[PDB]
Every structure is written in structure tokens, then in C-alpha cells.
Amino acid sequence: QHCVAEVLRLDPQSGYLKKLTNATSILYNTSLNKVMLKQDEEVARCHICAYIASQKMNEKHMPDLCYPKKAKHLMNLFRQSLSLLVKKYCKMTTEEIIRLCNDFELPREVAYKIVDEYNINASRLVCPWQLVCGLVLNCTFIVFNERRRKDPRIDHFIVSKMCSLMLTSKVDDVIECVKLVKELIIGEKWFRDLQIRYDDFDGIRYDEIIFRKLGSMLQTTNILVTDDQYNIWKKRIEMDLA
Amino acid sequence: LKQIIMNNLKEYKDSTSPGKLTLSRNFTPTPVPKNKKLYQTS
């Protein structure tokens, strides 16, 4: 029962779940009952069973159900028994850029938003690598501000990773791929929602930047350090005798 | 710390392996969206 649910709830990666588990159980039962369906490694015996379970109950969705040689064989047997920017005019799909965005482990809402941006504004393009790269980089900078702040090393590591993934040694082009997309995507409401959510606003907080720019001297430029920093640092020399 | 801190950055630059940097601890990977329809090519 554990593995059956493991594979069935792997489809995401009301009645659907219950009816699908029942269908898989009874289908596997029928396939193993007679001595007619043998030489079948259980390693993969819960995939097209799930496909036909989807086909049966009420509704069927072709995409991402077969997601290979023996797949068609088993289907028939069971159903009878029963650099990267110089390149010009490149093409892309949903899952290609989903992979490129998922190498960072970023959430799925951001990837879907980038995909929507692409499928809406991919008609007048010259190289989609630039737009997608800029989008994902400006998503990383906005969501990862906390760890970047506490560790200024990240900046170089992330840039090196996204310079090696696109197979280039020069990086000013990447800098352009960031700033141009920032210019282009600067005024959309979902971008606004992301900004208010992850509180970057150019890498500094709203309540500080307002006083930073309004013309005050109470603005907190943190050349000094926080009290908790000193409190936790004291321990390091507390044990200096060793 | 001008003379030492640069040495600290240089030495610590070569240490970390790029492979094992886990940007998020408790993330679940992005699956394949089911339907092709919603991705209208306007």
C-alpha cells in the first residue's frame, strides 16, 4: 500500500486519488491473476496502469501521464489481454526553462510566472536565453536577499554558477541581461506583489530607504554592529584560554 | 583588516565546493505542469 500511494501521489510531481488507487489496485490484480502477463519488472509496473486509470473514471489528460521502449509494448499487451546568447532564433518549451529555474530550487509560482511572461512576450524575440536568464537572476536576488545580506560571498558564487551554466567566460553581458530585464519588467502588478513579499526594494528595506532618501540624518547606516552580534561574539574569546 | 581580509577571501575562495551549496533547505522540486492549453501563445 505504501509504494502504491508513493507512485500514485507521484503524478503531481477529490475523487481522483481514491478512484485512482482503487483502479491501480484492481488493475494490478487483474494483470497478475492469470498466467498470461509475466516477465514484467515491478520496477515500472505502476505507470501505464495509472495512465489507463486516468483514462477510465471520468476525465483524461494526455500530457504528463506517460512522463519508454517497453511503455508502448506493455500498453498494447495489456489492452489486448483485457556562447548561449550569440545563437540567433532559438526555441524553448515549458520544461526546458522550468529546469533552468529549478536548478536553483526556486518555487513553482515564480517559474510559472516566467513561463507566462515568455508565452505572452516571446513573439518579437532575438534570443530567449537573455530574457529567461535575467528573469531568474532577478528572482534569485529578490528572494535570497537575507542570506546574501548575512553572507556577501553568495554574490560571486551565484554569478559564477549562472556564468558556467550558459558556457561563457565574459560576464558584462550577464550584467546587461539583468539590468535590461529589470528595465522591461519594472511595472507589472505581479512583480509588485513579489517585491512587497520578499522585501528587496533594491536590496534595502522600505522603512529604512524612505528616511535614507527623504533627507534625514537619523537614517540607520549600519557601520556599527547590532548588540546581539557582540553578545554572541563574546563567547568566542570567553574560551580563549585554550 | 586590509592586508589580512583579502588573504581570508582568497583562501576561503578556493575552499567551498560549488556542487554542495544548498540554497534552500526544505524545498520540493518543480514538477511538469499538466495541461498545454493554459499556456496560450498570444
Side-chain angles (χ1 to χ4, degrees):
Chain A
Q1 174 59 289
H2 157 275
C3 292
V4 166
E6 151 71 2
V7 298
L8 207 73
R9 300 181 172 208
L10 179 65
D11 183 32
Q13 170 65 268
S14 160
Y16 314 110
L17 199 77
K18 161 59 165 38
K19 279 92 179 182
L20 285 171
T21 183
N22 311 136
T24 45
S25 85
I26 65 176
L27 179 156
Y28 199 71
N29 188 358
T30 53
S31 71
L32 276 299
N33 279 128
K34 301 291 184 181
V35 73
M36 191 173 160
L37 309 96
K38 299 289 94 175
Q39 176 41 34
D40 316 309
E41 312 182 22
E42 178 41 61
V43 177
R45 283 189 83 166
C46 297
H47 178 70
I48 298 306
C49 313
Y51 190 92
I52 192 162
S54 299
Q55 182 272 331
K56 183 178 176 178
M57 311 335 297
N58 177 21
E59 189 204 50
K60 62 202 71 53
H61 281 280
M62 300 324 88
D64 197 343
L65 294 181
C66 291
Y67 173 55
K69 305 297 109 170
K70 288 171 277 293
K72 324 316 300 173
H73 294 105
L74 195 150
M75 185 180 288
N76 291 296
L77 294 174
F78 181 76
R79 290 180 182 173
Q80 293 179 356
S81 81
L82 183 62
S83 70
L84 272 283
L85 310 181
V86 290
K87 300 294 187 291
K88 285 107 190 162
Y89 313 83
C90 199
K91 326 177 307 315
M92 296 302 154
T93 62
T94 294
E95 271 287 325
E96 166 58 15
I97 58 172
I98 277 169
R99 183 277 319 160
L100 188 151
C101 182
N102 198 1
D103 73 336
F104 276 121
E105 305 286 323
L106 264 72
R108 303 166 206 162
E109 300 101 295
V110 60
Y112 293 170
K113 255 63 182 197
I114 291 170
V115 173
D116 194 305
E117 189 276 332
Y118 195 67
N119 69 18
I120 280 179
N121 194 340
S123 300
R124 308 184 289 282
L125 266 46
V126 168
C127 178
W129 286 113
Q130 282 211 140
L131 68 92
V132 72
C133 166
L135 289 161
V136 76
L137 269 71
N138 282 324
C139 295
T140 48
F141 271 31
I142 179 157
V143 173
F144 286 20
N145 59 333
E146 295 92 2
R147 198 157 102 197
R148 288 192 64 267
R149 196 213 323 290
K150 176 197 318 295
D151 294 86
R153 167 160 208 192
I154 299 289
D155 197 40
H156 192 88
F157 185 79
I158 303 301
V159 167
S160 160
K161 193 200 163 208
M162 290 324 98
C163 280
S164 88
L165 185 55
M166 301 325 138
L167 280 296
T168 191
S169 200
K170 275 72 71 177
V171 307
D172 299 275
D173 284 335
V174 188
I175 301 299
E176 313 322 320
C177 307
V178 179
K179 76 186 69 167
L180 273 77
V181 58
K182 194 52 46 171
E183 178 270 336
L184 192 173
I185 199 169
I186 195 162
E188 290 79 3
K189 174 163 164 52
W190 65 278
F191 185 98
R192 215 180 88 206
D193 203 346
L194 180 65
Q195 268 280 349
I196 179 164
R197 287 258 61 77
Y198 289 91
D199 185 40
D200 56 334
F201 293 70
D202 202 273
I204 298 104
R205 256 162 292 288
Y206 173 41
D207 308 341
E208 183 273 2
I209 189 159
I210 58 183
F211 283 123
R212 201 279 308 286
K213 197 155 53 43
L214 193 142
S216 74
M217 283 73 74
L218 286 66
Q219 79 192 31
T220 293
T221 182
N222 64 7
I223 296 89
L224 76 164
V225 187
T226 300
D227 61 79
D228 291 331
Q229 170 274 311
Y230 181 73
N231 194 67
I232 306 312
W233 179 81
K234 277 179 91 179
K235 313 302 183 62
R236 183 177 178 179
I237 316 300
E238 281 276 280
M239 295 296 172
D240 190 62
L241 62 90
Chain B
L1 283 72
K2 222 178 188 174
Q3 92 289 31
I4 69 165
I5 193 66
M6 65 182 179
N7 294 115
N8 185 0
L9 272 194
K10 148 175 82 172
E11 290 176 353
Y12 193 70
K13 181 177 175 66
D14 288 339
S15 75
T16 285
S17 78
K20 68 181 179 67
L21 184 151
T22 61
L23 275 181
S24 79
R25 331 298 205 198
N26 297 113
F27 172 74
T28 54
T30 307
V32 176
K34 280 160 175 175
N35 280 347
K36 268 178 182 173
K37 270 180 173 180
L38 75 166
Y39 292 165
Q40 271 175 354
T41 180
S42 68

